[PDB]
């Protein structure tokens, strides 16, 4: 009772029922670094300017 | 000019450019700090981005 697979379709993706748990950490990676803390607020004009040198803006 | 017009007015001169001074002092110790730890927003140098990395199965299975 054997019927040959037609063209395309061994090539399929199908589904798989396994009992098998889901790897949770395949990769074995360690903690990813804590990101730069993050600068937040309202833009305010600089405070008296450039403040480079004399200058007053 | 009178003297309080003069007076009040070096006040104010005074009050701005102190204030101006404190800030010159506080930028060169942030820069010192940020330049050595890396975790502020300057000094903050490119790494390679990971959105490039791509994820999907692969040809072959270790990897
Ligand atoms: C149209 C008028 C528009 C208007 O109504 O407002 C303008 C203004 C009035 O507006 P304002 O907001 O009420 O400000 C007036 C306050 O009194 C002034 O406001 P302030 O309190 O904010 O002070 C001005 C402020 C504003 O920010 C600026 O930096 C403006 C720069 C002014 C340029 C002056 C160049 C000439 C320097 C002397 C020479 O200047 C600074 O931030 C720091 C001082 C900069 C000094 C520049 C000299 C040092 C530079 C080093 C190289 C040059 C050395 C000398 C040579 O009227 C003006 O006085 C004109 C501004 C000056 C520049 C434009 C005129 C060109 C003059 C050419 C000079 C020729 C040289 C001959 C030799």
Redesign the pocket.
Known sequence: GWVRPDLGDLSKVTKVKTDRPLPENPYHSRARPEPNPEVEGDLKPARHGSRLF???? | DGPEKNYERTMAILQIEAEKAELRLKELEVRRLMRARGDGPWFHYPTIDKELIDHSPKATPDN
């Open positions: 004399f200058w007053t803006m």
